Design a protein around this ligand. Structure first.
Ligand SMILES: [Ca+2]
Ligand SMILES: [Ca+2]
Ligand SMILES: [Zn+2]
Ligand SMILES: [Zn+2]
Ligand SMILES: [Zn+2]
Length: 370
């Protein structure tokens, strides 16, 4: 959907209206902690709105915004499904970005930086809103259709007439309780995004094509914007339970992947063209190393990049890991330097590591994280 950098437009209306819906839907039996925590989110509504539009204006965005797309039936974005775009392939998609940002936001909340929590959470709800956008869930780019941008502008012009006051439910009903029943957050999130994205893909094929009428577009756009609002209301419910519930027993799951986020500092010579690797060693001594390389540039000055690393072993839990590292390999004998600001690591439902670095790393060295 459309948005503007100042935190307005369709994406902002969606998340803002979603807050109003949750307030209305909160049942008389809900604990005070959920209400209180929602109020903290309301106090930082501005940062939440800004988050909700930011990814369209992130200076580290990929050239084609391919992470804003997600086809629920293939589990891929268009650069992995469409033959013309295979050399832009990137594992990151709108489903995966939703939970990256939800997980990031929980960690900020645990630390008490509610402003940043709300900014991160708004970014997560941006991607979630995109997977509710028919063109995005059908993997149809702005390039493949002039109708794509046209459809989002149409939606934008009418966004205020799409505002819902409620889901149709209170938080005692299955709509909201379903979001709580699976302790595996990543699995629930993927499953919940699958439900909404498939609805949006159906809406593309049935109603939002370039050979559909104007009445068909109003339908696709009002259901689409409405679905996003509903979906966000539920997502927020689960989020607010995850950060407020002290008595919830915490679970552990085998990792399919590790998400590694790195920012390179904004000083002279901070960047590098060296090969950069992330690595782990389990307790049994098994070793896995990945190259950090999305297509296009990596580790240029001031650049934030996210690297999703698929595990070769399937019976690995985070607590099996003994060592982590970043390794810097240089092509040539000539001395060079890289200054990373930070590394964050996500595995499962949690940010496992946040390490401020701000120290130079020579090529041919290894930096130890754990
Ligand atoms: Ca350098
Ligand atoms: Ca690259
Ligand atoms: Zn959008
Ligand atoms: Zn779009
Ligand atoms: Zn987007």
């Amino acid at each position: 959907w459309d948005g503007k950098e100042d935190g307005t437009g369709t994406h902002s209306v969606i998340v803002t209206q979603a807050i109003e819906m949750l307030k209305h839907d909160l049942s008389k039996d809900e604990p005070e902690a959920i209400r209180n925590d929602l109020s903290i989110l309301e106090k930082n509504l501005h940062k939440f709105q800004l988050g909700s539009t930011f990814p369209d204006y992130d200076p580290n965005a990929y050239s084609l915004y391919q992470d804003h797309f997600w086809d629920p039936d293939t589990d891929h974005n268009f650069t992995q499904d469409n033959k013309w775009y295979l050399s832009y392939a990137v594992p990151d998609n709108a489903e995966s970005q939703t939970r990256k940002f939800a997980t990031l936001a929980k960690n900020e909340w645990d630390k008490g930086n509610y402003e940043k929590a709300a900014w991160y959470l708004g970014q997560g709800m941006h991607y979630f809103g995109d997977l509710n956008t028919p063109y995005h869930a059908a993997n149809v780019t702005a390039v493949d259709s002039p109708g794509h941008v046209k459809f989002e502008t149409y939606a934008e012009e009418r966004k205020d007439t799409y505002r819902l006051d409620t889901t149709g439910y209170n938080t005692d009903d299955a709509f909201y309780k379903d979001t709580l029943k699976n302790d595996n957050f990543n699995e629930w999130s993927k499953g919940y995004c699958k439900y909404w994205a498939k609805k949006a893909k159906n809406l593309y094929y049935s109603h939002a094509t370039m050979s559909n009428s104007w009445d068909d577009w109003e339908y696709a756009a009002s259901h689409g914007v409405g679905n996003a609002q509903k979906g966000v209301a539920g997502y927020l419910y689960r989020f607010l339970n995850d950060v407020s519930n002290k008595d919830a027993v915490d679970k552990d799951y085998d990792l399919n992947e590790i998400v590694v986020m790195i920012k390179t500092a904004d000083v002279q010579d901070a960047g590098t063209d060296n090969y950069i690797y992330f690595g782990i060693e389990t307790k049994d001594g098994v070793k896995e190393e990945w190259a950090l390389d999305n297509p296009g540039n990596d580790f240029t000055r001031n650049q934030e990049g996210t690297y999703t690393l698929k595990l070769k072993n399937k019976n690995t839990k985070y607590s099996d890991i003994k060592n982590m590292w970043i390794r810097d390999e240089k092509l040539t004998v000539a001395t060079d330097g890289w200054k990373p600001s930070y590394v964050k690591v996500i595995a499962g439902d949690k940010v496992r590591l946040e390490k401020n670095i701000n120290e130079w790393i020579s090529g041919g060295t290894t930096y130890t994280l754990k």
